[PDB]
Write a protein that binds this DNA or RNA. Structure first.
Lengths: 115, 69, 177
RNA sequence: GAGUUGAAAAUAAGCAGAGAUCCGGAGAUUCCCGAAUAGGUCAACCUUUCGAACUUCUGCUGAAUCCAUGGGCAGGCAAGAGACAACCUGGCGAACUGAAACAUCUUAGUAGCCAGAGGAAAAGAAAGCAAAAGCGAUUCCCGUAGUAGCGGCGAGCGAAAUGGGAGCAGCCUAAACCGUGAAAACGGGGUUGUGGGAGAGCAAUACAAGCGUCGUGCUGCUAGGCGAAUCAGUGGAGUGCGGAACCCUAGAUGGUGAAAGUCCAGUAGCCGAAAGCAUCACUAGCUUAUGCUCUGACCCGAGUAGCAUGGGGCACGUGGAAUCCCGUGUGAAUCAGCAAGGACCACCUUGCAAGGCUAAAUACUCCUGGGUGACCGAUAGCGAAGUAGUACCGUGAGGGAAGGGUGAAAAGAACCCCCAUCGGGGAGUGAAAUAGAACAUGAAACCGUAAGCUCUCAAGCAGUGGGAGGGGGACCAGACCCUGACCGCGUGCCUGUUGAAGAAUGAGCCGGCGACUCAUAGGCAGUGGCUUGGUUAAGGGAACCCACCGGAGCCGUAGCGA
RNA sequence: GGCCAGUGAGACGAUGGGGGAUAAGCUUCAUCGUCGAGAGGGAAACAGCCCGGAUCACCAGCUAAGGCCCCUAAAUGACC
RNA sequence: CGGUAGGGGAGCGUUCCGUGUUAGGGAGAAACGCGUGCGUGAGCCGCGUUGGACGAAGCGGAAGCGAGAAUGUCGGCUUG
């Protein structure tokens, strides 16, 4: 009742096709194709949570570098002082996006934070 | 085919009592009886239930005797 | 019903769990036997009733009494039949009660001993309908029930023992009124 | 009834419609070795007075020894030797193991070794079971029953009787008695059991059955024979598809370029044996043979049973240890008796040891002939799909591989060129030549070549998130795929540990093979079927499964106590 | 209770002690926390220390422990 | 709604079998390779100038049923 099969080769060929552009025996050699599928997926996990964290960090330092161009000592903390006292609910650090896509509009943002 | 064999060394020690519970004779009776008390010698003269641990151990080691639980 | 559309009910046939076919299946790897020991190794393993070198459960307990002596165990010598087996039966007012009546009616189904233990009628339960019993001997309370019902009661002498002629002579000498 | 001289083509000669080749029955030959056999032998050879040597049978002559015995000579189609996978019987007969050690025990009277023998063998016709009721040789199956027991009462071992089926079959011999002979024998009689037989006397005749070279009988087998019913179109080929018809007592199977009720071989059915074998039924014939009365004399298997010991085996390990068989030694009775009924005694019941032979049910496959397969498909299935127990290894015992598939048909490439070949390119065959003899689908590791992007100030389990620059096709042109300037982050996988990136283990890589499975039981859970309680086992069955029987048994109905 | 598993080598940290030399990431106990079986953040890295308990997605916001010169997110913030 | 040893529930796949001489298939089945598709995933479905004859689904059953480990093992091919 012999049971020679082919399902390991489709099982294995799917993982073989996912492991393209892995520079060498991480892209050809099955017994490393498996663990590069595995380590590639957990790399996708931690780099996804830390792409949320990392783009948060990037917008913080980008709008900090935008506000510090005034010359007078107005930090990023004081922009949030007078960004929540003057009631602006949650611009979500997308003013770090229109701070470079619309620099006159972020000058209107900050020049209305002053008043 | 192969029938299971009743373990004779425990069939001579354990017994079912109609409702289906293993009873047993207490130990320490056929040896050094003057040294004990009559209170002990009729405490150790009665047949009691076996406790649940060795009520579920020998229930599969003595298969043909109709014990529930 | 066609050959196509037949299917068992759910819960009737579970799938047998296969062991060592993946850790997502449930019992992969060591197949559900821990790490090491006699429980994981292949073979007969452990005798059931063995306490690991300790003197076991059965050896520390003294033997049951007649089984300790090798005396022949207590054995039923009759068929115990209550009157509750007789009222619930469909025996009407005119009916004989014997071995083949209780076999052919559906009360007793004796198979292992058709030859040795005849019958006995016991006391618990009532018997209002009168009958004509020619069976084997009775208890005192069942004799009170059956004679309290006004039914024909007849004991049946089964077998006659062989008495030696000097024992039959010594017993026949004892007839001194 | 039409072509043949094997695979296995070619060539040379034949043999054959007064019937070849081939098939079947019965015969003939069968060199040499091997029981091997005239003698030797280092098997397939040597020497030979050419021989079945030796044992057994028959016959003659007949030593020490008179009869004998031994020997010698001779005859003999002449009985045995040797081989045989498994089952069977008989004898020697373990140990690893289990008991969580180990000696009693178990494994186990199993394996192995030797001997023997048949399709079966052993056993087998009551000196038996049983229990006051009864059965009637042995064997096997279901059951009792994992019960009674046995056992460092440990591990374990484990009946038997009652019951239900398969299959049935019972017969010869010794003794007492007559007759012949110095016994030893021979011929008649008798072989049985709620007793017979011998001795004496009275009756009485034929019913039934058993055995069997011999040949007419029957069916079956070993060769075979007749045997129904369609074309056309389709991309190589049609049996598939679409259109038109038919057979069926035949639609099982195998093949045919491709899958077939109608193409072939066949099948269903009907037939057929000179010769041999087998099945039961005839036959010249041999045989079995009968009943009563009296009679305790005479007989009913002797170095035997029993006993004292030493044991073995019955499930029973020496225990109260019976039954059965042996070693040493003692050593009975005949029926008014003896043996058994689990020490033993008394009574009763049962049977008649010390003499043999028997078919069936039954177990197995080196096989043979049919039919099958939720069996395999070239690492599988037999070790073996070719030289397979082969090549090869070992002195030897012994160990032991691997290698399948071009096409439908070799139609296997005429001829030209390179050229010493091997090979290659045209051409030709083919549906396919990228199906070319390393030849069918051809995947991964591995080795390459071409195209796009990109690396030579760079530290990295080689990824991933973001994405500079660039390339490609595009249609939902914002999308998709490929490359990757640079930044952040990220201590291979398994095993297994308190703790593994670990400098603990494992793996060179790729692909296959490779592990909680099977039988029978106990327990529980889930789904059912009946609850006029449930359910059958063995066994019977249109080959198997199966409808339907088959109530034996099992479980639950009553417990307590040793 | 029924059926049915593993586990029975623990480790460190605080307290209570014994052995030691109040020496050990030492040994043995008693209560507790973590790891084991726990990811993330802080601890430069780093099982057991602090915050904290990961179903998953978001190029969302507010915080705990801890930090706000640069590498590296946020104060070269204010006053003693 | 983290999870090791472990326990339970629900499913995918493979070859064979019933339906099955099934639907479909030299107008290209299985294979092998492919995806701008769908799933929690095991996987399904679809496309192939490769290949050439078998064989789905659904409703069910049975396993020599699923591979990355055994200094596994058998072939092929590397490194040096």
């Amino acid at each position: 009742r012999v049971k020679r099969g082919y399902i390991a080769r489709r099982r294995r060929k799917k993982i073989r096709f996912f492991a393209s552009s892995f520079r060498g025996a991480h892209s050809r050699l099955t017994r490393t194709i498996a663990q590069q599928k595995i380590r590639a997926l957990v790399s996708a996990h931690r780099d996804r949570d830390r792409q949320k964290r990392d783009f948060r960090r990037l917008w913080i330092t980008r709008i900090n570098a935008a506000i510090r161009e005034r010359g007078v000592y107005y930090n990023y903390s004081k922009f949030i002082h007078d960004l929540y006292k003057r009631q602006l609910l949650l611009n979500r650090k997308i003013l770090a996006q229109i701070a470079i896509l619309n620099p006159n509009c972020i000058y209107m943002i900050y020049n209305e934070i002053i008043k | 085919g192969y029938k299971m064999k009743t373990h004779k060394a425990s069939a001579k020690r354990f017994r079912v009592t109609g409702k289906g519970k293993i009873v047993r004779r207490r130990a320490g009776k056929q040896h050094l009886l003057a040294k004990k008390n009559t209170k002990r010698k009729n405490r150790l003269s009665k047949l009691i239930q076996v406790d649940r641990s060795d009520y579920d151990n020998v229930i599969g080691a003595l298969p043909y005797l109709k014990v529930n639980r | 019903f066609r050959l196509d559309n037949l299917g068992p009910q759910p819960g009737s046939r579970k799938k047998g769990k296969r062991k060592g076919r993946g850790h997502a299946a449930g019992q992969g790897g060591s197949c559900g036997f821990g790490m090491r020991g006699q429980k994981s190794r292949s073979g007969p393993g452990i005798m059931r009733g063995f306490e690991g070198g300790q003197m076991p459960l059965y050896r520390r307990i003294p033997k049951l009494r007649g089984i300790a002596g090798g005396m022949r165990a207590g054995l039923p010598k009759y068929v115990p039949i209550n009157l509750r087996d007789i009222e619930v039966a469909g025996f009407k007012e005119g009916e004989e009660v014997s071995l083949e009546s209780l076999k052919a009616k559906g009360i007793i189904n004796p198979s292992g001993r058709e030859r040795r233990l005849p019958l006995k009628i016991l006391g618990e339960g009532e018997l209002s309908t009168k009958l004509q019993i020619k069976a084997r001997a009775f208890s005192g309370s069942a004799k009170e029930k059956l004679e309290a019902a006004g039914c024909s009661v007849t004991v049946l002498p089964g077998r006659k023992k062989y008495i030696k002629e000097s024992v039959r002579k010594n017993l026949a000498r004892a007839d001194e009124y």
